[PDB]
Amino acid sequence: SDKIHHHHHHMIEYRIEEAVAKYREFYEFKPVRESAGIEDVKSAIEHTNLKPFATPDDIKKLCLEARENRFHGVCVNPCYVKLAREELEGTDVKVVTVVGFPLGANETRTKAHEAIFAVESGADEIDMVINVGMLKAKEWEYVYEDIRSVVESVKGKVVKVIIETCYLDTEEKIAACVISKLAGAHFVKTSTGFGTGGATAEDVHLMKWIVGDEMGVKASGGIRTFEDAVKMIMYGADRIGTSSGVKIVQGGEERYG
Amino acid sequence: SDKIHHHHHHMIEYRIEEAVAKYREFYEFKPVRESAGIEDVKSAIEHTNLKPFATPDDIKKLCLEARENRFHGVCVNPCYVKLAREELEGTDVKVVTVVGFPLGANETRTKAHEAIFAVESGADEIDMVINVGMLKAKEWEYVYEDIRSVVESVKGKVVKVIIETCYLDTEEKIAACVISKLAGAHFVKTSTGFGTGGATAEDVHLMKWIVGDEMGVKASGGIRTFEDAVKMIMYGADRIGTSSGVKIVQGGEERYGG
């Protein structure tokens, strides 16, 4: 009903304003952790290949690298979820895929179907993209329902919302986090890697600050080195999205081992 | 069954090899048409905004520009098909959207559902992305079924297959066109605009030469000027994917007249 959705849109706007007011009065940028070691970095890494030209052989190599390095999970496009699941069968390495990715501009019902299909094919977690255009137009109820439909469709499974920080101002980043939390998502995530920018420590920390300890932040896009990964964890990242995990581990062992 | 899929995979391989043979023996790069005017360019343009940050207001403006300039269609992300249809009601400007776009790496059923939903919402045509990685792995039957399932799901609507030429060698461009044609698609298209390169006259001509005169070629990615649009049409493009349509038209009028 319009009445119900209009009221709900209003309550979202007030929650966003509350967060912005608290940010303006109390926010300060500083680390959340003293340090981060090699094992902490491995445990945070979701080892990723989302290239449109990746082959089945590339995915097999990615899953092998995840086993060898003890990464948290792999992240692959939906067409390769079944393959990744078979390659990792018997291990604790998670299979993560992406929904409505990388543009976030699918019909909500397509996102919801893609998520359902992914879980049926063996995904443990879903990283979806927010509708950035609709967020920028302040259509909060649309953005809410878009995330909520995906969350409810795979309830019991982890859903991460990619907010695509590179296209947003500070208040829009805050709005994206607040809406993702209200909709029952488990993580917010910085970037698709297909936009104009990637993870910054400033964005990661703001996100963690807004969402709190009980919701995850995943830093992604441009994380190439051990130092990059450590920085993101020190400023509040719970997971890292990268395709450079092999070099990250090698740099950690070489420079800090 | 697996025998039937196996046999069909082999059949496709033979069709690709036949096309490559013809190309090696007979291909010559040259223009298909001696020129193109402003009315030709307008008729070819699919006026596009697929930016993830596009707002409803941006889409309304896009549709206005398409009506003002008498372009063939607009091309918008699926969330905006119903909006574009409403904005164009009473005109014959087509509403085009994109499926499995831009990475082509969704499960086939997801592409097929997305296409059905887009047609239910009011799309006239669908531009889908080929699964590039499975093409590069020579999984011809997978690639065929992925296209065919979409085509059949929206029977009666035009389906274009984006082959994403920037990631393919010459033989793979040929294979992508042969498969697209066999699967019943109506057009092949060069580029998503989210890869590492866009349309070239050499790609457009090669694709038109392989698919022939009863299948279309849409040139897309990096088409900025009137002269670029004319070039693509001269070498075999039937449609132009661009966001620069306003400057393309103004450009042709200023430099060559109405």
From Swiss-Prot, chain B:
Its primary localisation, in coarse terms, equals cytoplasm
This entry carries the following GO cellular component terms, namely: cytoplasm
- A Pfam family annotated for this UniProt entry: DeoC
Q: Which SUPFAM superfamilies match?
A: Aldolase
Pathway per its UniProt entry is: Carbohydrate degradation; 2-deoxy-D-ribose 1-phosphate degradation; D-glyceraldehyde 3-phosphate and acetaldehyde from 2-deoxy-alpha-D-ribose 1-phosphate: step 2/2
Sorted keywords for this record are: Cytoplasm, Lyase, Schiff base
Q: Where is the active site?
A: 127 (proton donor/acceptor), 189 (schiff-base intermediate with acetaldehyde), 218 (proton donor/acceptor)
Reaction catalysed by this enzyme: 2-deoxy-D-ribose 5-phosphate = D-glyceraldehyde 3-phosphate + acetaldehyde
Signal sequence, renumbered to the chain: none
Query: What superkingdom heads the lineage?
Result: Bacteria
Q: Does the keyword Chloroplast apply?
A: no
Q: Which CDD domains match?
A: DeoC
Alphabetically, the GO molecular function entries are: deoxyribose-phosphate aldolase activity
Location in the cell reads:
Cytoplasm
Question: How does this protein's activity depend on the pH of its environment?
Answer: Optimum pH is 6.5 for 2-deoxy-D-ribose 5-phosphate cleavage.
**Which GO biological process entries does UniProt record here?**
2-deoxyribose 1-phosphate catabolic process; carbohydrate catabolic process; deoxyribonucleotide catabolic process
Q: Give the Enzyme Commission number.
A: 4.1.2.4
Role description: Catalyzes a reversible aldol reaction between acetaldehyde and D-glyceraldehyde 3-phosphate to generate 2-deoxy-D-ribose 5-phosphate.
What's this protein's family per the entry? Belongs to the DeoC/FbaB aldolase family. DeoC type 1 subfamily.
What NCBIfam families is this protein classified in? Answer: deoC
Q: PANTHER family, alphabetically?
A: DEOXYRIBOSE-PHOSPHATE ALDOLASE
Q: What is this protein called?
A: Deoxyribose-phosphate aldolase
Q: What is the lineage of its organism?
A: Bacteria, Thermotogati, Thermotogota, Thermotogae, Thermotogales
Gene field: deoC
